């Protein structure tokens, strides 16, 4: 018995087009259909410079924007050998972590709105509209902040942003507590989530989950502890790791990972060195407006970096960061030219949404939206 | 194993005046009345809402909204036709054609940003050498018809003169970065 | 005495040492079928001998873990059983030996990578206990 389970609530899971082969109410197999959001991203990037390539990444995962620009930047610094300053690293993490918070605040309470709890959605989205007052203030666009450029980061924080991020972090433990007091204790929540989509660790490894769905099963594997790719080796934070694997562990993790991300934000705030914002290598970082206008040699680079590009040397690397969805890695083959060459984007949600087939076997049809909830399936990456 | 796991996870809470504590929580909703109480606290608290048309959300001088071609204080469009923004544009929205005007100084005969084919990433504002193209904080230009949304060659992007009073302010405050 | 492996699915095995001895003896016996002058057989022999030795010497699973610093004995059993699968697989489609042409181009690019880039750091040494 085949059922074309589509997007239950649009605007939350946009193009979800499962084709469930059911058995009464018990689902026997879930066959997701991809491509409804397949923009030509892995082709369009081959046609544009390494700078023009960056805006696609904030548009790859639309609920955790800067994590993908941070995964791309670290793939055009893996090749460029472009050492970025300490302040660029600290800002880059303070925003990758603000993005982890922006994602878990959505991927928890959009999940909690698919399950049925209507209010956590709107509380978490007031919180997200506080964090977009930081995105929009530091770069310009509330969602797609093309801000974490290859060398360092686009431009320094405004002169009042750390004070505001602090005044937000002080009041954010309470918001997590409310999102938690409203959902963690509920017997209507546990019942809707405990023993739902349980993934034994061998399955989370096999299906390349590598995210909050690889730390549910108990595999202690965070690419901020495994492969520290910034000040992360300096910052202190504990990676919460589940013990059962059910969608109630992944929720409890995403609601603790939203507190450890608060620890990382507070650290990045309390220790942010007053250094240069971009790599001093002005052939990888366009010089400031003031310098390119006054200096002829800076003007030449501002011209050959906003038209030509880097021309990062010939290589091929797989740089993977811990994006909120999971291990978002961008395999970036680079022909010597200024344009990338098959900038393949390993995006979790392409490996997670595979897991829907075995996660939601023998679960009731109303659980198939809870699974899609805890996978944090955002179809931009799929 | 799940059978033994159940037996043990239920033999953990197996001492009187603990079975009673858990029974009371299930018998009289305790976690759920803590949900209702929080929900009530938020029902009575002030509302984080904004009656939009009259007051609008906070922005920043770096905010990227409607593209505006700036002008030099003494008229003379700031847009010398280098085509750097036409080059840097990721979506290739800007189409620039250049002609030595009769005065002799280069200028763009055609400077058409296609707003629909535009990602509002501010690359044009960065790439332009003289700050000729900047994004005005407008962001309120929803058009009834698509053809209007294609911003014509240097005529509608020349409406930035109205927004110059705010664009000049944002630039005077952002240029420090 | 072990309550549970934190990992889900890897069920705690009470008779860890015994099945480990069984698996490592099976592995030592089954590896004999691959040619001796193959790096795979030297490796299997060496680490299987080391783990079988440390499993015979020590008695508790905790001491097996402590000396043989390779995680948990349940994951060790997973590794040993997967190794037995591989040796019984390698017997088939035997890849041992090198054909005459053997063109293998080792390529080394030594460009240093910037430190602040994902670099898989080694992690704690078996002095974790």
């Amino acid at each position: 018995f085949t059922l074309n389970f589509g997007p239950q609530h649009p605007a939350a899971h946009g193009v979800l087009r499962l084709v469930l082969e059911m058995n009464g109410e018990v689902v026997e197999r879930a066959e997701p259909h991809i491509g409804l959001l397949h923009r030509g991203t892995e082709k369009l990037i081959e046609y544009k410079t390494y700078l023009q390539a960056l805006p696609y990444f904030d548009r790859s995962d639309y609920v955790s924007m800067m994590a993908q620009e941070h995964a791309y930047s670290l793939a055009v610094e893996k090749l460029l050998n472009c050492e970025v300053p300490l302040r660029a690293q600290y800002i880059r993490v303070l925003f990758c972590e603000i993005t982890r918070i922006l994602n878990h605040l959505l991927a928890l309470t959009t999940h909690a709105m698919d399950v049925g709890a209507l209010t956590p959605f709107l509380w978490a989205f007031e919180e997200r509209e506080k964090l977009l007052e930081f995105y929009e203030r530091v770069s310009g666009a509330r969602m797609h902040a093309s801000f974490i450029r290859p060398g360092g980061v686009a431009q320094d924080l405004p002169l009042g942003l750390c004070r505001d991020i602090d005044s937000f972090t002080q009041q954010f433990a309470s918001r997590i507590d409310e999102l938690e007091e409203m959902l963690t204790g509920n017997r209507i929540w546990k019942q809707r989530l405990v023993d739902i989509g349980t993934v034994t660790a061998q399955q989370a490894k096999d299906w390349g989950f590598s995210g909050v769905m690889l730390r549910g099963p108990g595999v202690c594997w965070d690419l901020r502890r495994a492969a520290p790719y910034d000040v992360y080796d300096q910052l202190d934070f504990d990676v919460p790791v589940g013990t059962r694997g059910d969608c109630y562990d992944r929720y409890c993790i995403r609601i603790e990972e939203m507190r450890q991300s608060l620890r990382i934000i507070v650290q990045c705030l309390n220790q942010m060195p007053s250094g240069m914002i971009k790599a001093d290598d002005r052939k990888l970082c366009p010089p400031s407006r003031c310098r390119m206008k006054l200096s002829m040699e800076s003007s030449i680079h501002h011209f050959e970096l906003y038209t030509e590009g880097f021309s990062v040397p010939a290589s091929s690397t797989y740089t993977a960061v811990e994006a909120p969805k999971g291990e978002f890695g961008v395999f970036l083959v680079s022909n010597g030219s200024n344009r990338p060459y098959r900038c393949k984007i390993r995006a979790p949600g392409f490996a997670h949404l595979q897991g829907l087939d075995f996660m939601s076997k023998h679960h009731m049809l109303a659980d198939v939206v809870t699974i899609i909830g805890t996978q944090d399936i955002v179809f931009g990456e799929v | 194993d799940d059978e033994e796991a159940e037996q043990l996870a239920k033999e953990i809470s197996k001492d009187w005046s603990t079975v009673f504590e858990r029974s009371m929580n299930t018998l009289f909703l305790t976690e759920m009345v803590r949900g209702l109480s929080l929900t009530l606290k938020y029902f009575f608290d002030p509302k984080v809402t904004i009656n939009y048309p009259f007051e609008k959300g906070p922005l920043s001088p770096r905010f990227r909204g409607e593209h505006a071609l700036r002008r030099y204080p003494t008229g003379e469009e700031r847009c010398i036709a280098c085509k750097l923004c036409e080059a840097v544009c990721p979506a290739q929205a800007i189409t620039i054609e250049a002609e030595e005007r009769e005065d002799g100084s280069r200028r763009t005969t055609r400077y058409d940003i296609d707003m629909t084919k535009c990602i509002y990433c501010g690359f044009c504002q960065e790439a332009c050498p003289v700050d000729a193209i900047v994004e005005g904080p407008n962001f309120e230009f929803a058009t009834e018809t698509h053809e209007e949304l294609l911003y014509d060659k240097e005529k509608l992007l020349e409406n930035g003169d109205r927004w110059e009073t705010e664009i000049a302010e944002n630039l005077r405050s952002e240029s420090l970065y | 005495v072990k309550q549970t492996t934190g990992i889900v699915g890897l069920d705690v095995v009470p008779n860890a040492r015994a099945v480990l001895i069984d698996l490592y003896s099976k592995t030592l016996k089954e590896i004999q079928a691959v040619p001796e002058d193959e790096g795979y057989r030297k490796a299997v022999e060496s680490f299987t001998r080391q783990r079988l030795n440390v499993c015979k010497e020590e008695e508790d699973w905790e001491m097996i873990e402590k000396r043989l610093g390779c995680g948990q004995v349940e994951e060790l059993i997973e590794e040993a059983r997967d190794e037995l699968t591989l040796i019984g697989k390698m017997i088939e489609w035997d890849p041992w030996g090198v054909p005459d042409d053997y063109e293998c181009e080792v390529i080394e690019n030594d460009a240093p990578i910037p430190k602040h880039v994902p670099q898989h750091r080694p992690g704690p040494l078996p002095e974790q206990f």
Binding site: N23, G24, V26, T184, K190, Q191, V194, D195, I196, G218, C220, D222, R225, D238, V239, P240, V241, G242, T243, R244, D246, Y248, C252, E256, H362, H363, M364, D367 | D2, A5, E6, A9, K10, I12 | G6, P124, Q128
Partner: peptide
């Protein structure tokens, strides 16, 4: 249907961090 029902019993909540709390 003999499908495995979602048993809403489990072990009690105990926040499980990684071993790198104090000294890696």
């Amino acid at each position: 249907a003999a499908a495995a029902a979602a048993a809403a019993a489990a072990a009690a909540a105990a926040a499980a961090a990684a071993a790198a709390a104090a000294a890696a």
